[PDB]
Amino acid sequence: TSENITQKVVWVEESDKRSFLLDLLNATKDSLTLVFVETKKGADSLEDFLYHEGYACTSIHEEALHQFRSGKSPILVATADISNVKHVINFDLPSDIEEYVHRIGRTGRVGNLGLATSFFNERNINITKDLLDLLVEAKQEVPSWLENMAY
């Protein structure tokens, strides 16, 4: 159970995810930001977007992993060897809660709190109730919208 990972689930429309990611990145870490996306093409295109924004980043979908650790590339974009990152960003959420749990486990260590931010929209209605129940048992912030969509 994930009480020691602060989880912020926010509503982001698909067309808003990229500028919301830039505001979030600025808002939040000098390194070890891990951003999960749904597809290989998505990983690829997001890395390029970030590049043209001026953010040093890599993607995986050894070099890449070796840049992440050194903090030469503060951002690693990955699809579906990595733990104790400073921030996990679920740019796309997965279709089941177990996979959510696996991904958020990559932030935090014993004696410290992790941080995981997840973007959610109508595409994610399938995981609504499971995410709600997980947030409640982990005593995390639950957005009014999530509660009302689960019902």
Instruction: List beta partners, residue 115.
Output: 6
Rounded Cα distance between 35 and 43, Å, is 9
Token pair, residue 135, equals: 């947030």
Rounded Cα distance between 104 and 87, Å, is 9
Instruction: List beta partners, residue 85.
Output: 107
- CB 104, CB 113: distance < 8 Å: no
Give the resolution value in Å: 1.9
Q: Provide the Cα torsion 58, 59, 65, 70; round to 10°.
A: 20
Which residue, 89, 21, 14, is CA-closest to 55?
A: 21
How far is C-alpha 80 from the geometric centre of its chain's CA atoms?
Answer: 12
Which residues lie below 8 Å from residue 35, measured CB to CB, with a gap of 6+? Answer: 21, 46, 75, 76, 77, 78, 89, 91
Q: Which CATH architecture has domain 1-151?
A: 3-Layer(aba) Sandwich (3.40)
Q: Strand, helix or coil at 23? A: helix
How far is C-alpha 115 from the geometric centre of its chain's CA atoms?
Answer: 9
Rg (CA), the chain: 15
